[PDB]
Design a protein around this ligand. Structure first.
Ligand SMILES: Nc1ncnc2c1ncn2[C@@H]1O[C@H](COP(=O)(O)OP(=O)(O)O)[C@@H](O)[C@H]1O
Ligand SMILES: Nc1ncnc2c1ncn2[C@@H]1O[C@H](COP(=O)(O)OP(=O)(O)O)[C@@H](O)[C@H]1O
Lengths: 365, 368
């Protein structure tokens, strides 16, 4: 089997929201995230695999950064050190708390640095001069189904981002023609590459934020593990490689509540199509794991086509969604809750928790 | 509702008037202590009546003289006791013109009536039981009925040829009838009560007539709302059990024949309205007294604003007391007889009073 671990991070209230007294609409009951519109009408309920209640630091089950890491990412490291492939998707709207979860701040670090440093630590523990490791990484983006390299020195002129193309190797699967790769030995030599890429990544000001993401981003870390057998015959030939993919996805963005035209419209359509195809892929993989063999439409998008070998077979996939609990963003949070979901979401009416002043059926009983 | 509180009736004989001394009127009402005997001056026929209480303010030095404070300490103080217990209470006057209803209820500056003593005793009792467990909240209103319209006495008018803004009455399904828009003022002390009362009595309508040079030509209802917020022994929130009580003190106008107090126009109009209201009240009293004897009877509450707003006091849910005021002059023997007959008919009324815990259908209900 190869299942898909879907998870959700409920951001806590920010200072602006506490000052405006923006009321809470996303609540938890443990194994369920519930949405109760302030009108107290159709109450939505979603059952995921893992729920991260980062809402209030004193509530039971408080999802710290270390908690989230040990919950989702570390099994991907343990899997990578077995010779299998791993993929971590990050989805969320802007302001929902996605970068906090993936990257982190100067303090309270996130999945990216935690995974990197724990990886290097386990590498050091497993170094013997009988077993060796090599780490090579790349970082690229997808924009209107065209691939661009993020680690390339570029000047200022018109239409400078030269598009690369995907190609299918019969054994190794799909790849990008002309994409650069760079060798690493720590995290301090990853940070300066990521900071070079995230400045070339496409952005544009919109009704949601003046600096939003408008292109999918893939950071791929390729590990090669070399072994040697003591039979005096297998000279540095036992090779096994693994790929860890970390994919920052852009938001859906409805073109109805944002009157747009031209390039922003095109970007939204492309992003939307990519997300739809990714959802089809994840659902079909879930069905495959539950037994019924199906056809995965990998080929309907550059992202899925390039990530084909990292979302199938003997592999591990995780999808971290990030949602905000404020009532000011019902449509986006529900859009992000309806998206990241493999099972069936249930809806009811639950304004009848006010039967008689904290029901008090204790009296009736 | 496990009770039956009988309406408590009193009678007060006022002294001879200037008018009734100018006309050489005789004495026809007498007492033997607790009973009240009335005699026609023709020496033809005698009647007797018996009440729960009877007062005798005919002469200062006579035996049994029931002064203003004695009337208070006999009637109004138990109503304050029940108000502190948690019951709604009502005290209303009745009588012919010039009987002395406004005097008995409000009084003069040198002889305060029942209201300035009730409110003062209330605040004084509070000052001894305002401990840490229980707090108190007091609101007041004071409204008027004039030509079947409702007016507020505790506002300062504008200045126009017409500055009597009429309110309307409504029927809440649970709380019963009430007045829409009535200024309910939060009170702190007896001095504030007195200020509001002065303003209201200065705003109330009056006029000179042939039987009262300062006549009470409008019905007046004085409402107090007292909320005692007490505390249980709690692991959480204190001050979590409240009891409410409404005290309604009512000064009504007198019958008044149009020929005796000869005056035309607005005086006649408002006298007619007064007469109509009194008729409807009499019908209500008779119908309740007939209910008390086991018959199926319909109470005409809706035929007048007065009874409509007092629906919960003449019957319903509150402890009620009536004060009939009579004159000993022989010239008014018929009206004295009518008043006394309605009063003794009122003793048969039985109201179902309950405590306003505001805990029934909440927790004390199934607790007990
Ligand atoms: N677990 C958390 N606790 C407190 N604040 C958080 C948490 N997660 C996210 N945030 C807040 O979210 C903000 C990041 O939002 P932003 O990065 O603009 O959205 P996005 O990640 O979608 O671009 C941070 O300023 C941070 O204060
Ligand atoms: N017990 C009493 N002692 C002295 N005066 C009285 C007494 N009862 C009535 N009066 C006199 O009767 C007059 C009219 O009383 P009032 O209450 O205004 O009658 P109404 O029922 O018309 O309001 C007052 O001026 C008052 O002096």
């Amino acid at each position: 089997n190869s299942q898909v671990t879907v998870a959700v991070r409920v951001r806590p209230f920010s200072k602006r929201e506490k000052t405006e007294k923006a009321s809470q609409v996303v609540f938890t009951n443990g194994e369920e995230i519930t949405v109760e519109h302030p009108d107290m009408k159709q109450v939505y309920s979603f059952i995921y695999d893992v729920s991260f209640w980062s809402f209030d630091e004193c509530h039971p089950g408080y999802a710290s950064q270390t908690t989230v890491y040990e919950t989702l990412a570390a099994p991907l490291l343990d899997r990578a050190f077995e010779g299998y492939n791993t993929c971590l998707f990050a989805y969320g709207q802007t302001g929902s708390g996605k970068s906090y979860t993936m990257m982190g701040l100067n303090e309270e670090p996130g999945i990216i640095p935690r995974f990197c440093e724990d990886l290097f630590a386990q590498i050091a523990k497993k170094q013997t001069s009988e077993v060796s490791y090599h780490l090579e990484m790349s970082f690229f983006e997808v924009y209107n189904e065209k691939i661009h390299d993020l680690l390339v020195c570029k000047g200022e002129n018109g239409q400078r981002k030269q598009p690369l193309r995907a190609r299918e190797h019969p054994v190794s699967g799909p790849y990008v023609e002309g994409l650069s790769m760079n060798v690493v030995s720590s995290y301090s030599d990853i940070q300066s590459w990521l900071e070079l890429g995230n400045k070339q990544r496409a952005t544009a000001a919109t009704g949601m934020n003046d600096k939003s993401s408008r292109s999918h981003s893939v950071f791929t870390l390729v590990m090669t593990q070399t072994k040697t057998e003591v039979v005096e015959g297998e000279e540095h030939d036992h090779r096994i490689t693994s790929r860890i993919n970390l994919v920052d996805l852009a938001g859906s963005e409805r073109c109805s509540t944002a009157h747009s035209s031209g390039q922003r419209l095109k970007e939204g359509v492309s992003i939307n199509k990519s997300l739809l195809t990714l959802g089809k892929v994840i659902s079909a993989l879930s069905e495959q794991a539950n037994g019924k063999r199906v056809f995965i439409p990998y080929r309907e998008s550059t992202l899925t086509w390039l990530l084909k070998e990292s979302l199938g077979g003997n592999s591990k996939t995780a999808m971290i969604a990030t949602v905000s609990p404020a009532a000011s963003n019902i449509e986006e949070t529900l859009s992000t809750l309806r998206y990241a979901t493999q099972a069936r979401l249930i809806v009811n009416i639950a304004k009848v928790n006010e039967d008689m002043n904290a029901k008090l059926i204790r009296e009736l009983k």
